[PDB]
Paper text:
The [name]-1 viral spike is composed of three copies of the gp120 envelope glycoprotein attached non-covalently to three copies of the gp41 transmembrane molecule. Binding of the primary cell surface receptor, [name], to the gp120 component of the viral spike exposes and/or induces the formation of a site for co-receptor binding (either CCR5 or CXCR4). The [name] chemotype consists of three essential regions: Region I, a para-substituted aromatic ring; Region II, an oxalamide linker; and Region III, a tetramethylpiperidine heterocyclic ring system. Herein, we present the high-resolution structures of [name]-557 in complex with clades BYU2 and in complex with clade A/E93TH057 gp120 core, as well the structures of four Region III [name]-congeners, AS-II-37, AS-I-261, MAE-II-167, and MAE-II-188, in complex with the clade A/E93TH057 gp120 coree.
We used this gp120 coree H375S variant and co-crystallized with [name]-557 or racemic mixtures of (±)-AS-II-37, (±)-AS-I-261, (±)-MAE-II-167, or (±)-MAE-II-188. The parental [name] compounds possessed a para-halogen substituent on the aromatic ring of Region I, whereas the latter four [name] analogues possessed a para-chloro, meta-fluoro substituted aromatic ring. The structures of these four analogues (AS-II-37, AS-I-261, MAE-II-167, and MAE-II-188) in complex with clade A/E93TH057 gp120 coree (H375S) revealed that the Region I and II moieties within the Phe 43 cavity exhibit nearly identical poses to [name]-557. In Region I, the meta-fluoro substitution on the aromatic ring of AS-II-37, AS-I-261, MAE-II-167, and MAE-II-188 visually increased shape complementarity between Region I by filling the gp120 Phe 43 cavity near residues Val 255 and Ser 375. Electron densities of the Region III moieties were, however, not as well defined as those of Regions I and II. The poor electron density of the Region III tetrahydroisoquinoline of AS-II-37 led us to model AS-II-37 in three conformations: one for the (R)-enantiomer and two for the (S)-enantiomer. We selected a conformation of the (S)-enantiomer in which the tetrahydroisoquinoline nitrogen was positioned to make a weak electrostatic interaction (4.3 Å) with Asp 368 of gp120. Congeners (±)-AS-II-37, (±)-AS-I-261, (±)-MAE-II-167, and (±)-MAE-II-188, which displaying similar affinities for full-length gp120, equally enhanced monomeric coremin and full-length gp120 binding to 17b. These enhancements of 17b binding were comparable to those observed with [name]-557 and DMJ-I-228, except for with (±)-AS-II-37, which exerted somewhat reduced enhancement for coremin binding to 17b. In particular, the binding modes of (S)-AS-II-37, (S,S)-AS-I-261, (S,S)-MAE-II-167 to gp120 suggest that the Region III moiety can be further modified to improve the interactions with Asp 368gp120 in Area A.
Numbering used by the authors: 44 to 124, 198 to 301, 324 to 355, 357 to 396, 411 to 492
């Protein structure tokens, strides 16, 4: 017997104790070795209710990631509660590694194995495990990168689709590589991302179709963000310690629904910290080719309001709350207390 409960989880990884990479260094001092031959008990005739949108596991991982950044990612100047904090801002080795989240004694992690589980409600196929799968603390907006792919069909996730204020998480079932590089040799901040239009449009089309299922076959329209912080209006992400801001206008136009889509990007030193604690300035980009090939595994969308009296539903690429990023990977997990 067991009950839904919250407890201080611990982490496990395969970090190398000799790596200068921030993630490795952190996990080396904050995590333990992974279990080479882990156990998993499949519960037959068991029905458990999940709720990705209200899961303490998310908050905890958020706290870890924040800690990892507070230790190995301090900017030159930090702007917070009216205070100005200045400190060294040396270049570092940056490349996220898988992080497993585990439960201590007396607790276990229930895992939903339903093919098309949307993150909320009852789960038919439930199993018990000590740790989750390896999850990369990849911070980004608009597009989810290097995540996990859905098993069968594309999955739409939301605490409440009827509410436009609630973020939407599109879980892709097929990856779409995005090639981002900052050429060695002008403007040391000019960058770009290449994407196979054929693949992207094919996926985006499938996304629209699935969205129709949840919106009564209403016409699905994509549009670029109305306004706000650059981190939201643009696909922001971190590549090798450098912050990339990419214009995804070409990615979200309802025309191609063929060639290589080239997105205009720029490395920003001044940024609005995702921790939501003001602004911060980092050092200039390093020299040489700055390349990062990532898998687009999910999309963060925001639905426009005031469309109830129209046959259209407008979706725009959003983001900001990194917690949603962790949800897109922890949706199938929940902690329970064993008697
Ligand atoms: O300032 C941010 N959100 C603040 C705020 N924005 C509006 C929406 C929102 C929602 C919840 C919490 C904060 C916010 C932010 O997300 N920054 C950021 C920086 C670097 C990368 Cl790589 C990145 F992906 C994001
Ligand atoms: C997820 O499944 C539950 C249970 O069937 C359902 O109530 C809810 O509407 C679904 N959520 C989405 C986003 O479709
Ligand atoms: C999930 O359960 C259904 C029956 O409810 C079963 O048909 C299906 O094979 C299961 N999915 C998995 C884990 O393969
Ligand atoms: C990139 O996508 C491919 C194809 O799905 C996958 O095999 C590979 O593991 C992905 N790389 C990641 C997630 O880092
Ligand atoms: C992805 O999911 C969609 C349904 O959302 C499905 O039609 C399609 O066959 C899936 N693609 C793959 C590669 O399985
Ligand atoms: C979902 O959101 C809609 C729109 O705000 C709201 O009317 C409704 O009460 C919400 N449903 C739930 C389950 O809270
Ligand atoms: C990524 O794009 C760059 C620039 O076009 C190219 O040189 C490189 O070969 C690409 N990488 C992959 C994995 O295709
Ligand atoms: C683009 O994607 C298609 C499949 O959608 C593939 O057949 C083709 O080889 C890709 N083009 C390039 C430039 O790799
Ligand atoms: C969308 O249209 C199809 C084909 O007519 C129909 O089978 C399905 O019920 C509709 N889906 C809705 C209205 O959610
Ligand atoms: C984003 O970039 C596109 C071109 O890729 C441009 O047309 C558009 O004006 C830009 N949006 C803004 C206002 O940043
Ligand atoms: C839509 O995206 C395609 C990608 O090839 C681009 O060529 C086209 O200019 C875009 N249309 C717009 C921005 O209206
Ligand atoms: C995505 O994964 C690839 C392969 O490990 C890595 O090279 C790249 O840096 C990752 N992208 C991001 C933004 O973390």
């Amino acid at each position: 017997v067991w009950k839904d409960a919250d407890t201080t989880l611990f982490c496990a990884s395969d970090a190398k104790a000799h790596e200068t990479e921030v993630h490795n260094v952190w996990a080396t001092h904050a995590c333990v070795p992974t279990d080479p031959n882990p156990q998993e008990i499949h519960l037959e005739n068991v029905t458990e209710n999940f709720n990705m949108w209200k899961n303490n596991m998310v908050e905890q991982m958020q706290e870890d990631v924040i800690s990892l950044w507070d230790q190995s990612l301090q900017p030159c100047v930090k702007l917070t509660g009216g205070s100005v904090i200045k400190q060294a801002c040396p270049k570092i080795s940056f490349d996220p590694i898988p992080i497993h989240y585990c439960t201590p004694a007396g607790y276990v992690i229930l895992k939903c194995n339903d093919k098309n589980f949307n993150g909320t409600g009852p789960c038919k196929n439930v199993s018990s495990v000590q740790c989750t799968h390896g999850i990369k603390p990849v911070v980004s907006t608009q597009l989810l990168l290097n995540g996990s792919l859905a098993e069968e069909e594309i999955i739409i996730r939301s605490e409440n689709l009827t509410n436009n204020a609630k973020t939407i998480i599109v879980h892709l079932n097929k990856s779409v590589e995005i090639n981002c590089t900052r050429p060695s040799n002008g403007d040391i901040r000019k960058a770009y991302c290449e994407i196979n239009g054929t693949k992207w449009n094919k996926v985006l089309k499938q996304v629209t179709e699935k969205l129709k299922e949840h919106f009564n076959n209403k016409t699905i329209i994509f549009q670029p963000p109305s306004g706000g912080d650059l981190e939201i209006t643009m696909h922001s992400f971190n590549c090798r310690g450098e912050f990339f801001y990419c214009n995804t206008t070409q990615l979200f136009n309802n025309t191609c629904i063929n060639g290589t889509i080239t997105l205009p990007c720029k490395i920003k030193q001044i940024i609005n910290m995702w921790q939501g604690t003001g602004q911060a300035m980092y050092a200039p980009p390093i020299d040489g080719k700055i390349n990062c090939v990532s898998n687009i595994t999910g999309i963060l969308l925001t639905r426009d309001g005031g469309a109830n009296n129209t046959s259209n539903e407008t979706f725009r690429p959003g983001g900001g709350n990194i917690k949603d990023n962790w949800r897109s990977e922890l949706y199938k997990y929940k902690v329970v207390q064993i008697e």
